[PDB]
Design a binder for this molecule. Structure first.
Ligand SMILES: *[C@@H]1O[C@H](CO)[C@@H](O[C@@H]2O[C@H](CO)[C@@H](O[C@@H]3O[C@H](CO)[C@@H](O)[C@H](O)[C@H]3NC(C)=O)[C@H](O)[C@H]2NC(C)=O)[C@H](O)[C@H]1NC(C)=O
Ligand SMILES: *[C@@H]1O[C@H](CO)[C@@H](O[C@@H]2O[C@H](CO)[C@@H](O[C@@H]3O[C@H](CO)[C@@H](O)[C@H](O)[C@H]3NC(C)=O)[C@H](O)[C@H]2NC(C)=O)[C@H](O)[C@H]1NC(C)=O
Ligand SMILES: *[C@@H]1O[C@H](CO)[C@@H](O[C@@H]2O[C@H](CO)[C@@H](O)[C@H](O)[C@H]2NC(C)=O)[C@H](O)[C@H]1NC(C)=O
Ligand SMILES: *[C@@H]1O[C@H](CO)[C@@H](O[C@@H]2O[C@H](CO)[C@@H](O)[C@H](O)[C@H]2NC(C)=O)[C@H](O)[C@H]1NC(C)=O
Ligand SMILES: *[C@@H]1O[C@H](CO)[C@@H](O[C@@H]2O[C@H](CO)[C@@H](O)[C@H](O)[C@H]2NC(C)=O)[C@H](O)[C@H]1NC(C)=O
Ligand SMILES: *[C@@H]1O[C@H](CO)[C@@H](O[C@@H]2O[C@H](CO)[C@@H](O)[C@H](O)[C@H]2NC(C)=O)[C@H](O)[C@H]1NC(C)=O
Ligand SMILES: *[C@@H]1O[C@H](CO)[C@@H](O[C@@H]2O[C@H](CO)[C@@H](O)[C@H](O)[C@H]2NC(C)=O)[C@H](O)[C@H]1NC(C)=O
Ligand SMILES: *[C@@H]1O[C@H](CO)[C@@H](O)[C@H](O)[C@H]1NC(C)=O
Ligand SMILES: *[C@@H]1O[C@H](CO)[C@@H](O)[C@H](O)[C@H]1NC(C)=O
Ligand SMILES: *[C@@H]1O[C@H](CO)[C@@H](O)[C@H](O)[C@H]1NC(C)=O
Ligand SMILES: *[C@@H]1O[C@H](CO)[C@@H](O)[C@H](O)[C@H]1NC(C)=O
Ligand SMILES: *[C@@H]1O[C@H](CO)[C@@H](O)[C@H](O)[C@H]1NC(C)=O
Ligand SMILES: *[C@@H]1O[C@H](CO)[C@@H](O)[C@H](O)[C@H]1NC(C)=O
Ligand SMILES: *[C@@H]1O[C@H](CO)[C@@H](O)[C@H](O)[C@H]1NC(C)=O
Ligand SMILES: *[C@@H]1O[C@H](CO)[C@@H](O)[C@H](O)[C@H]1NC(C)=O
Ligand SMILES: *[C@@H]1O[C@H](CO)[C@@H](O)[C@H](O)[C@H]1NC(C)=O
Ligand SMILES: *[C@@H]1O[C@H](CO)[C@@H](O)[C@H](O)[C@H]1NC(C)=O
Ligand SMILES: *[C@@H]1O[C@H](CO)[C@@H](O)[C@H](O)[C@H]1NC(C)=O
Ligand SMILES: *[C@@H]1O[C@H](CO)[C@@H](O)[C@H](O)[C@H]1NC(C)=O
Ligand SMILES: *[C@@H]1O[C@H](CO)[C@@H](O)[C@H](O)[C@H]1NC(C)=O
Ligand SMILES: *[C@@H]1O[C@H](CO)[C@@H](O)[C@H](O)[C@H]1NC(C)=O
Lengths: 993, 47
């Protein structure tokens, strides 16, 4: 915090916890200046000498050292004083030579921060060299006249006096730095209660995000903002009168006169000893009746009756809008003036001022008119809400100027009809002189939230219609991607070198001036930040997105004879996905979360009975409903036991799958790929002993009453689940004799697409080379462009962001006076504090309601993905069904599951070949036999269309080019053929002897 | 708003935006009565 752009300044000796927090104080810099080696011919600066000043008349000063270098010993540091107009402040490590009465020549001694007037000394305090290890900085601040040896306070007094000089003695060391400063707002991230860095509100593009959204280390995505700045041509449109007017406001005056007698018994017998009225235009009301006239606050009988007129009498002169107005003063009684003279009287509402009056006043009320009361003057006001007359103080400056010249299409200030805004104004009267766009009462149209959408103006050849829309920066955005700021996505064109979809784009200069314009590059998939056919990298430059797709084929559908394309060779294209399957159960302890560790707050809480039952029952229900069918999910899919490690030194044939399964040398039972998944992201003793940076938030949670519960499947019972599942996928089948742990399963699962089982010595190394290329693309794919990794990222960030906002909802006070509850009862009254405490407790229980509802919605999400998970485990892993492109964009071969952060990660293996052959095809036969008969042969279902090669005839499967002689069980005999055949004269059944 | 069952009556020269909005005022009808051509022998009513 001792950089060349700001000086830190600790806010008064306490520290709020780990996180960003805002302050306001003298933090900036202006006129940085250096100085070094202010010593004479002596080998060390002598202690106690106050000389060596430097005249600076500024509103601050700061003497800063290099980063923790200047020790307190001899030949290194001396007095380093300011001075005010009369009083001084000087530090002195006065170790003994002969001079001061301290008598110590060592460390572990004290200091002397002491003020000094013209002749004498006072305020000796002696802070130790402990807690102040090394001289870092030294300020002197104008307001409150306080002085700051590095960080906290050492001395305040009464005055408000600016700095006049400063100066430091030292023999050698770092070159010291003098700097003066102004006062801005800033906020400082600090962990453990000591400042690391600050963010200033200096109008920088990095600063405005922190200064408006009260945070740093921001998430990725979009963020809107503002920067209000306008000194341009303002224009005012006043309310036009009939014709030929100079807008002159009338002045209605009042004065207490030599009034008459107080009233007799009747409430109609009180006479208004003034009368005024409002007709049109503008007015102001000179009330000189604040002179020794108290205001009487309304209560059950006496006082004012200002309900139905929310303004108070000394606030009429601001901009209001009435429809008819008439005020008058009247000297009646006080206890029943307004409460009777509003209902049965002649005014909408009335006020009741008072003074020192004689107590001979006959009051007005039914049945109580025989006493003697006070006589304070009561004013009347007959308000009718509307828009005909407007009350204002200053005279309107448009003096004989009919509205001919007001600006259009420029970002101006406007004050039209007493409602201040900031936007620009178009001309829309071409579409509005038709469609009777306003009725016979022509003034503005309010939209919602009290602004103006369309107003009128009068004075030209014909009346027009103007529309008000806000300026160019009403919604600017700037894109962040990953960890840092990239550029402002605005609506204006400040030579913006890039156009996105319906928005203009600029880019902030990072160091060098270049790298502003380039040719866009085509990206397959990007997870960074995506915005409408355009993708933004953390480098800063955009790159347009265009999705790829892979080929597929269903090709044999055969009419009249023509050659067809069926594959001979084949490849495997991997595809991943992630499905969530678990949830952390919570347990809200409402009594310890709402109130702190106090003796009180609990007796006030014990009439909030059933709301803790309501906040507890839904959490208990979702906990039980998750915990039962989680064990159902574990008992439906855990195959047979198979408690065998299978730790990937098992000799397979030619399939390098040891990349994908677990290793012998690891402290946790973990393979390589889910270790790569884990590096992108319940037994403790919370009393003593930390573990990590993120796992040790459990002690901050348990000390506020948000604790977790272990699942019904225990820890180290799920790390055997994945290994047992792949062990049942591999070993299931063979009797473990003949080097077949993983290969034979794959070859006997790949020939189900055609129609054979477990063929040898053909299609054995082709599968090996194809699967080796597939796992090569797989080990390339995870680190840069995959599908599972960003899903892992979004799920982990949402699961963390649910609970970390209902912990930071504690310092957020509700409608109240403070946040903590220990010092509400100490500042104010007893029976007035209970409303504050009730508001705060109701707010915190509302926050727990939000937590429980979010947890139930997330439970519905995870139960959905868990039943999809048990369906995909039951089908894609152990079955190999023929459902086309259920899992992995094609007719799938095999899957292998792996562990994840609270889920499972699949690896699907598709079947998409590309290399084809060109072979002639035919659709049927009709052989005629010898004596008398006729039939046809059509290829049956599930055995594929049949082809010919160089004279002979062969059937084949629809996916693998595998010629084979036609047998007797693949025929369909039909008594028809219609010249779309071959018609061999001899039989082609090829039966046997 | 000039039917035979109500008379409109604009609430004080400003207009709230597109949508339904409530007021209270003299809007009903009782004893509708007609009248026509209140002129004499002159070709136009004198101002
Ligand atoms: C603001 O105006 C008030 C009304 O004009 C003034 O109050 C008046 O003060 C007079 C002097 O005390 C009173 O006159 C006396 O009233 C009593 C009845 O209570 C008679 O017996 C006295 O004979 C009479 N004094 C005479 C005639 O000399 C008025 O009655 C009284 N008016 C009232 C109460 O309504 C305020 O003094 C005045 N405030 C200022 C100017 O600051
Ligand atoms: C917003 O649009 C309005 C609609 O075009 C403009 O109002 C027009 O201003 C013109 C000039 O003042 C008027 O033209 C004049 O019309 C009269 C009668 O038709 C002719 O005798 C004049 O010769 C003619 N002036 C010329 C040709 O220079 C338009 O009649 C008038 N249109 C209306 C009132 O509907 C507004 O001026 C415009 N706003 C601004 C700020 O320019
Ligand atoms: C800054 O404060 C110091 C400390 O009082 C001032 O030093 C004194 O100056 C007066 C007259 O200038 C001398 O009579 C005193 O002897 C000085 N004090 C000591 C301890 O020697 C200094 O003048 C102030 N700076 C300015 C610019 O006024
Ligand atoms: C701060 O400490 C100094 C020590 O120098 C105190 O100064 C003494 O003041 C008294 C009364 O004025 C004198 O009789 C002594 O001779 C001074 N000591 C010296 C010169 O060594 C000063 O009073 C202290 N300030 C307080 C207690 O407010
Ligand atoms: C929050 O932001 C601060 C920036 O002030 C990060 O602190 C930096 O972290 C990197 C990581 O190695 C260090 O190299 C820097 O030296 C740190 N700077 C300072 C001033 O300490 C901090 O890591 C962020 N916290 C996150 C992202 O959780
Ligand atoms: C705030 O205190 C924590 C607690 O010690 C510090 O966290 C330690 O950071 C070091 C890094 O140098 C790790 O080696 C330790 O394992 C961490 N302790 C844990 C996790 O308990 C943290 O660095 C402190 N912040 C500072 C000094 O700015
Ligand atoms: C099924 O058994 C056959 C016969 O043993 C295995 O074929 C052997 O394959 C290896 C690897 O290519 C060759 O070195 C041998 O010469 C083959 N044996 C022969 C031809 O008799 C086949 O690999 C087995 N299938 C598996 C293990 O999945
Ligand atoms: C600004 O810095 C210059 C550096 O030489 C210095 O001379 C001057 O006094 C400074 N002005 C101030 C501190 O007002
Ligand atoms: C404050 O110091 C500056 C330094 O040059 C001087 O010009 C100015 O007169 C001073 N103001 C005073 C002594 O009131
Ligand atoms: C700081 O000083 C300025 C000087 O004008 C003053 O207006 C402001 O109120 C002060 N800030 C405080 C006392 O927090
Ligand atoms: C500020 O407080 C001191 C303390 O005694 C006093 O001497 C001084 O007069 C006060 N300043 C005022 C009242 O302006
Ligand atoms: C906001 O306005 C200020 C005032 O000129 C300007 O310096 C700053 O660059 C603006 N922020 C942007 C354009 O992001
Ligand atoms: C009184 O009204 C006149 C116009 O009638 C105006 O010029 C003058 O400023 C007003 N007096 C005030 C506001 O004190
Ligand atoms: C109200 O009238 C008094 C009568 O002298 C006058 O002094 C005062 O300035 C006026 N107040 C205004 C015009 O705000
Ligand atoms: C934005 O301004 C540039 C000038 O550098 C211009 O070439 C471009 O056409 C403008 N964009 C528009 C008008 O959409
Ligand atoms: C498909 O397989 C053939 C031979 O097995 C190979 O030459 C070709 O490169 C593969 N195509 C891919 C993997 O896209
Ligand atoms: C594979 O690793 C296990 C782990 O202990 C070991 O027992 C076995 O002998 C290893 N297989 C070898 C070395 O062939
Ligand atoms: C499998 O691939 C890994 C990746 O480096 C390699 O270390 C290992 O030797 C390979 N195993 C084989 C080819 O049997
Ligand atoms: C665990 O916490 C208990 C709490 O009393 C404590 O007695 C024990 O020493 C702790 N164990 C440690 C710190 O290893
Ligand atoms: C197969 O070969 C024939 C003749 O050589 C040709 O007409 C036909 O287009 C080929 N089929 C392909 C290339 O798919
Ligand atoms: C009611 O209407 C009749 C004619 O329809 C008329 O003569 C009478 O004066 C009316 N009464 C009123 C308006 O009170």
């Amino acid at each position: 915090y001792d950089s060349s752009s700001y000086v830190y300044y600790y806010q008064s000796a306490f520290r709020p916890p780990n996180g960003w927090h805002l302050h306001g104080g003298a933090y900036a810099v202006v006129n940085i200046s250096s100085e070094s080696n202010n010593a004479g011919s002596s080998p060390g600066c002598i202690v106690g000498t106050i000389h060596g000043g430097r005249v600076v008349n500024a509103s601050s000063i700061a003497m800063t050292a290099p980063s923790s270098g200047m020790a307190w010993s001899s030949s290194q540091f001396c007095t380093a004083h300011c001075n005010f107009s009369d009083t001084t402040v000087f530090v002195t490590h006065c170790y003994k030579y002969d001079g001061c009465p301290i008598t110590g020549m060592l460390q572990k001694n004290f200091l002397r921060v002491s003020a000094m007037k013209n002749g004498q000394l006072f305020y000796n305090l002696t802070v130790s060299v402990a807690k102040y290890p090394t001289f870092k900085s030294f300020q002197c601040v104008n307001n409150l006249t306080s002085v700051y040896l590095n960080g906290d306070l050492v001395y305040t007094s009464n005055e408000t006096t600016d700095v006049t000089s400063a100066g430091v003695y030292f023999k050698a060391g770092g070159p010291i730095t003098y700097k003066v400063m102004r006062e801005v707002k800033a906020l400082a991230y600090f962990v453990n209660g000591t400042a690391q860095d600050v963010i200033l509100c200096d109008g920088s593009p990095r600063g405005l995000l922190a200064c408006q959204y009260n945070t740093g280390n921001f998430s990725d995505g979009f963020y809107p903002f503002i920067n209000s700045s306008l000194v341009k041509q303002k224009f005012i449109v006043y309310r036009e009168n009939s014709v030929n007017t100079t807008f002159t406001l009338h002045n209605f005056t009042f004065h207490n006169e030599t009034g008459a007698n107080p009233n007799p018994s009747g409430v109609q017998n009180i006479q208004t000893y003034q009368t005024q009225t409002a007709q049109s235009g503008y007015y102001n009301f000179n009330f000189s009746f604040l002179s020794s006239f108290v205001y009487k606050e309304s209560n059950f009988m006496y006082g004012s009756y200002h309900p139905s007129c929310n303004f108070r009498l000394e606030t009429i002169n601001n901009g209001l809008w009435f429809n008819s107005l008439s005020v008058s003063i009247a000297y009646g009684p006080l206890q029943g003036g307004c409460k009777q003279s509003v209902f049965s009287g002649r005014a909408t509402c009335c006020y009741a001022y008072s003074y020192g009056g004689p107590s001979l006043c006959k009051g007005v009320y039914s049945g109580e008119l025989d006493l003697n009361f006070e006589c304070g003057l009561l004013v009347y006001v007959t308000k009718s809400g509307g828009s005909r007359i407007q009350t204002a103080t200053e005279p309107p400056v448009i003096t004989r100027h009919n509205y001919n010249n007001i600006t259009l299409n420029t970002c101006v200030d406007y004050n039209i009809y007493g409602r201040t805004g900031q936007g620009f104004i178009t001309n829309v009267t071409d579409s509005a002189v038709s469609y009777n766009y306003l009725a016979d009462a022509g003034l503005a149209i309010l939209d919602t939230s009290g602004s103006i959408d369309i107003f009128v103006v009068q004075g030209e050849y014909g009346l027009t219609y103007y529309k008000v829309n806000p300026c160019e920066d009403v919604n600017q955005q700037f894109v962040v991607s990953g960890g840092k700021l990239v550029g402002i996505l605005t609506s204006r064109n400040e030579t913006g070198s890039q156009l996105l979809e319906n928005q203009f784009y600029i880019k902030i200069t990072n160091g060098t001036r270049r790298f502003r314009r380039s040719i866009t590059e085509n990206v397959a998939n990007c997870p960074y930040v995506s915005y409408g056919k355009f993708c933004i990298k953390p480098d800063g430059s955009i790159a347009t997105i265009v999705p790829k797709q892979l080929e597929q084929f269903v090709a044999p559908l055969l009419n009249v004879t023509e050659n067809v394309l069926i594959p001979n060779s084949f490849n495997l294209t991997v595809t991943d996905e992630y499905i969530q399957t678990r949830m952390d159960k919570v347990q809200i302890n409402c009594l310890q979360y709402v109130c702190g560790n106090s003796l009180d707050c609990r007796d006030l809480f014990q009439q909030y009975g059933p709301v803790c039952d309501n906040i507890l029952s839904v959490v208990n229900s979702i906990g039980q409903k998750e915990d039962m069918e989680l064990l159902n999910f574990y008992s439906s899919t855990k195959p047979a036991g198979f408690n065998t490690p299978f730790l990937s030194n098992v000799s397979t044939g030619e399939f390098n799958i040891s990349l994908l399964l677990t290793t012998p040398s690891s402290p946790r039972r973990r393979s390589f790929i889910e270790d790569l998944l884990f590096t992108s992201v319940a037994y403790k003793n919370c009393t003593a002993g930390p573990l990590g940076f993120l796992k040790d938030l459990a002690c901050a949670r348990e000390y506020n009453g948000l604790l977790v519960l272990p699942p019904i499947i225990t820890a180290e019972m799920q790390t055997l689940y994945t290994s047992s599942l792949v062990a049942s996928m591999a070993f299931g089948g063979i009797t473990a004799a003949g080097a077949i742990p993983f290969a034979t399963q794959l070859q006997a699962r790949i020939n189900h697409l055609g129609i054979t089982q477990s063929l040898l010595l053909k299609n054995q190394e082709k599968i090996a080379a194809s699967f080796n290329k597939a796992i090569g693309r797989m080990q390339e794919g995870f680190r840069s462009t995959s599908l599972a990794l960003q899903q892992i990222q979004h799920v982990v960030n949402k699961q963390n962001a649910i609970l970390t906002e209902t912990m930071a909802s504690l310092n957020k006070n509700f409608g109240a006076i403070s946040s903590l509850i220990q010092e509400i009862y100490q500042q104010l009254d007893a029976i007035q504090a209970n409303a504050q405490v009730d508001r705060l407790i109701t707010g915190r229980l509302s926050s727990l309601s939000v937590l429980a509802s979010a947890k139930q919605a997330e439970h519905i999400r995870v139960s959905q993905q868990r039943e999809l998970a048990t369906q995909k485990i039951n089908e894609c892993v152990k079955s190999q069904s023929i459902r086309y492109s259920f899992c992995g964009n094609g007719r799938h071969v095999l899957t292998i599951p792996q562990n994840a952060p609270n889920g499972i990660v699949f690896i699907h293996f598709s079947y998409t070949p590309d290399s084809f052959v060109n072979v002639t095809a035919i659709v049927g036969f009709c052989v005629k036999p010898a004596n008398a008969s006729q039939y046809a042969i059509v290829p049956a279902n599930g055995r594929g269309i049949f082809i010919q090669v160089n004279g002979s005839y062969y059937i084949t499967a629809r996916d693998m080019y595998m010629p084979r002689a036609i047998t007797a069980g693949d025929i369909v005999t039909l008594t028809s053929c219609q010249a779309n055949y071959v018609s061999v004269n001899k039989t082609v059944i090829t039966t046997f002897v």
